[PDB]
Symmetry: C3
Subunit: 258 residues, 3 copies
């Protein structure tokens, strides 16, 4: 109970999965301070999951333990602990990629199922590794159990990495949708850019004003804004950019800043 353990998944909210994972954790670490991020990441989207954990890592105190489980390839992908000034407990499938931009890494461990089972006492399922591997590992780490006790160290440079950088051709960026929020605001992977006056969505016949807040255009109008995530956000004031553009996470857009 010294540090927080955060949870990010695509498991969904209807059913037992999250509760099972939490009770498994609290079994091991009864004083754990378990903080939900989301369990509503778009199904199997390791990209959107990575974005979400990135934002939470940026604001968490050092020593925080982050459990992330978006795991379509569950089965012989590795389960890993990344040990840094913060911890990540994640499938080795590139989920760690964005949060890793903000963590100084000391070491990486592959979790050994046999050694986890020692601590839990129950059969490791083929598919629900949040309950049987990742949650327990997070709880154990926060309890002061060294990853060496349930895993073995592996090279930091061996882990799966997502391709997340945007492309630029001349004055045209080719940007990827990395997150869409419940408003339908659309987050694109452009960061560290000088603020423009205009953002052109070349594929859509739209030249959007770049403004600080939604209420600086009429209701129903589309704009671009900084948002709170240090990327580029496209929004409809009191509406859904995602619906109007018919875009989804992973879609690429041609974008010019003017």
């Amino acid at each position: 109970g010294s540090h927080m353990i955060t949870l990010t998944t695509d498991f969904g909210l209807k059913g037992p999965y999250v509760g099972e994972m939490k009770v498994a954790m609290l079994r091991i670490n009864p004083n754990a301070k378990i903080v939900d991020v989301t369990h509503s990441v778009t199904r199997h989207s390791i990209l959107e999951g990575s974005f979400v954990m990135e934002q939470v890592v940026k604001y968490s105190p050092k020593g925080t333990v982050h459990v992330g489980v978006i795991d379509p390839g569950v089965g012989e992908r590795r389960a890993i602990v990344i040990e840094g000034d913060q911890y990540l407990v994640v499938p080795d499938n590139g989920l760690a990629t964005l949060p890793l931009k903000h963590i100084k890494v000391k070491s990486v461990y592959e979790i050994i199922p046999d050694k986890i089972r020692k601590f839990t006492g129950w059969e490791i399922s083929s598919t629900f590794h949040g309950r049987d591997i990742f949650g327990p590992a997070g709880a154990l780490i926060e309890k002061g159990i060294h990853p060496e006790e349930f895993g073995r160290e592996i090279p930091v440079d061996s882990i799966v990495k997502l391709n997340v950088e945007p492309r630029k051709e001349g004055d045209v960026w080719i940007l990827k949708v990395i997150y869409i929020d419940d408003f339908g605001n659309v987050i694109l992977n452009l960061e560290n850019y000088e603020k423009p006056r205009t953002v052109e969505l070349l594929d859509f016949n739209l030249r959007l004003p770049y403004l600080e807040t939604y209420g600086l255009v009429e209701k129903g109008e589309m704009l671009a804004l900084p948002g709170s995530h240090d990327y580029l956000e496209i929004a409809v004031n009191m509406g859904s950019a995602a619906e109007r553009l018919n875009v989804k996470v992973g879609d690429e857009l041609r974008v010019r800043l003017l």
Copy 2:
């Protein structure tokens, strides 16, 4: 960690916003007892948000701190702390209106961003004031930091108030939909009324029996009931009144009690 801090937002559940706000809070107040109400208030509905906080305030113990963030007009609206036998930490946009029916107010403070930034250490975003202003203020207040330290007192009668009272013309009430729940039950702003035998929805050709519970009519039938909120509830037994009537929050209905 002496009193509860409740959270009510329209931020949604898919993404990092709620987790960011929580970790920001726990940074400041590691022992905070943070209780989620909802983050699924209808987008930008200050009215439905106010209703939801009203119901939670009614059942919370004195000293409880209520953070509410439904903030379409974020940008030069004020961020305020209402100091009473309970606290409200809200945008000055009328969200406080219904909960204020149940709080004895001592004083009101405008939060000064510059003074909050002193405590957090990070740049205040243009749009995510839950993370950068409201959550921190709630955490600070519960930690025993006086609002005077990060704000300045303003008159209680200067704050934005929602128009929430129903209208009556003769024997006809003109009622507003203030909440629709996940069942599609429809809550109308009529309170403190003598229970009728019948509730006529004049616009809809319906004369509904007023009954204590859903199971007192056949499945699929519509009724009116008291519910648990001290308003008037319209429901379909095992169905959705909202869908059948095609109504939304803010819609007005002509209603007669017989």
Copy 3:
């Protein structure tokens, strides 16, 4: 705060209901460790609720208190406490049936509303017994208040039980859908079966491979798998079996194992 109190409901996430119930609980038991399972059980589905509590009970430590509220028949159904090596606080409507497979029961109590009101102080509503009866009873039990103090013992064999066993005709099972998760994976009430090589959905013209993980078939293909729940799961790799089969909880399917 010695043991966990878990919460499973169909109340939904949009609105005040869950927050009200939690603040009522924490009023009574300020140190309660309240663990959300789900509030997104399919409306009024006592069957799916029972499944969800079953899975959480299986992984909770002894002494855990489980509050379950899926209560379409609220009104003269009983409110009960099941006292065992774990506790259940539930409507007497068969919600307890699946979790009871995993609990050694000592005694059962009917909650007496008048005696609960002694402890809460407020009027018991006709419909929101989570806030006014079940949550308080859970909080009180975890606080060390004996059920005898707010109820009266009743025979364990008098409580409502769901019919949950599958039927078999020759080599054909008639299985019921007991849960559908957020992926659209479909859980059928077949347990304790020898793993087949093939699962035929006789009604659908499908002969599915039985495999350990989703990624063992092409994307879009349907399979059967063990899952993590000790039942039988039907899934589309990276899709929705529920949508493809057009099935809902309670639907019955003819199924042959080959």
